[PDB]
Amino acid sequence: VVYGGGAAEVTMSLAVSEEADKQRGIDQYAFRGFAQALDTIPMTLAENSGLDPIGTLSTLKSKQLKEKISNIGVDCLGYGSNDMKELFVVDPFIGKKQQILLATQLCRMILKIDNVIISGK
Amino acid sequence: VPSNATFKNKEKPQEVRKANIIAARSVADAIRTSLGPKGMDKMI
Amino acid sequence: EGVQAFIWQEFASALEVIPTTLAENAGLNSIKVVTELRSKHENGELND
Amino acid sequence: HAASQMAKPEKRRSYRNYGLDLIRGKIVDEIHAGVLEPTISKVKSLKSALEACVAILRIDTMITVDPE
Amino acid sequence: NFGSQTPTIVVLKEGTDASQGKGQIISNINACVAVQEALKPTLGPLGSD
C-alpha cells in the first residue's frame, strides 16, 4: 500500500539526493537528474490546479526534512489537510513501483540509440 | 485553494517561447564547437 | 529569499558553458576539470 | 637513407644523393645521372602543400546554400 | 551489308557495369569500411545501439 497525491515521489526524491553527496564521483550528477525527475509529477499536479510548483515543492521538501512523516503531498481538490491519512487517498505500491521501473528501463534503451535508420513509407 | 483567483488562457505563447528557445539553442550548438583555441573553422 | 534568487542560481550555472566547452573541444572531461575549478577558485581570487 | 644519418663523420660518407632509375630499375647516383632540381622548388612546394591541408583539417561543418 | 547502319557489336549486353582501370578493387574496400563505420561504436559494454 502507498498514499498518493504526490507524497510518494517527494519521499523517494530526497532519499536519492542524499546519496549523491556521499557517493560523489562521476555519478554524483546522475542521482541529481533522477531526483529532479521525481519532483516533476508533484509540480505537474500544481500546474493543472493553478498553483505555484515552486512554492508547493518547497513545502513538501521542507516537511520531510523536519519530520519523518511521508504522508504529506499535493492536494488538487483544495480540501486542506495535506496529510493523506485524513484525505483517505490510497494507491497500490505495485502500481507506483512499476512507474519507476518502466521509466528507468526504457530510458536506458533510448540513450543507447546512435544511428537512426528510418525508411520512407 | 484551486478553482479561485484566475485560470491561464491562450497557452500558445507558452509553446511559442519554447519553440523560440529550442530553435535558438540549435543554432548555438553549431557555433559552440568553434569556441576556444580548440575550435574549428566553419566553411559556408 | 525570493523567486528572483532562484533564477540567479540558473544564471550562474549558465555561465559554466564556456569552461565546459573548452574541455569538450580539447577532449578532456568537463566534470573532472570543473571539480578542480570549484576547489581552486575558492581560495584563489582570480587568474585560475 | 637510413644508413646516411648513421653514416657518421670520418669523403667516404656517400649513402646520400641516391634515387630511383625507372628505366634500368636500379639505384644509382643522381649527380652522375644528370638529374637535378632547384632547392627553392622544395621549399615553396612543402609550404604551399601544407596550407592546403591545414585549411581542410580545420573545417568542422560545411554549409551549402542553394542559389536563389 | 543488309543496311547502311551496320551496328557495332558490343561484347556484353547493355546495362553491364565496367571494371579494371584504377580503383576497381578499392571500391570494394570502401564499401566494407563504410559498413564497419556503423559497427565500431557498438563495440564494448559502453557502446551504443
Map chain D to HEC letters: CHHHHCCCCCCCCCCCCEEEECCCCEEEEHHHHCCCCCHHHHHHHHHHHHHHHHHHHCEEEECCCCCC
Alpha-carbon span A97 to A12, nearest angstrom: 11
Stretch (H or E) spanning A11: helix A7-23
Closest of A3, A24, A27 to residue A81, by C-alpha: A3
How far does B30 lie from chain A, in Å, by closest CA?
A: 19
CB under 8 A, 24+ apart: contacts of A97-102: A100/A12
Q: Is A26 on the interface with C (CB under 8 A)?
A: yes
CB under 8 A, 24+ apart: contacts of B18-25: none
User: Cβ separation of B40 and D58 shorter than 8 Å?
Assistant: yes
Closest of A37, A72, A43 to residue A57, by C-alpha: A43
- Only one residue has cell 528507468, namely A104
Give exposure, B4-21, as e/b (b: 16+ Cβ within 10 Å). Answer: eeeeeeeeeeeeeeeeee
Closest of A91, A71, A75 to residue A83, by C-alpha: A71
Q: β-pairing, D59-62 with D26-29?
A: unpaired
Chains E and D contact (Cβ–Cβ under 8 Å for 3 or more pairs) = no
Q: β-pairing, D18-21 with D26-29?
A: antiparallel
Give exposure, E11-34, as e/b (b: 16+ Cβ within 10 Å). Answer: eeeeeeeeeeeeeeeeeeeeeeee
- Please name the member of A109, A112, A115 whose beta carbon is closest to the beta carbon of E38: A115
Residue E27 φ/ψ, nearest 5 degrees: -60, -30
User: Cβ separation of B3 and A51 shorter than 8 Å?
Assistant: no
Alpha helix (H) residue ranges in C1-48: 3-14, 17-25, 30-43
Residue E22 φ/ψ, nearest 5 degrees: -135, 125
User: Cβ separation of B38 and C22 shorter than 8 Å?
Assistant: yes
Q: Which residues lie closer than 8 Å to D34 by C-beta, 6 or more apart?
A: none
Q: Is A59 on the interface with B (CB under 8 A)?
A: no
Chain A: residue nearest B6 by CA? A50
| Structure obtained using | cryo-EM
- Only one residue has cell 646520400, namely D16
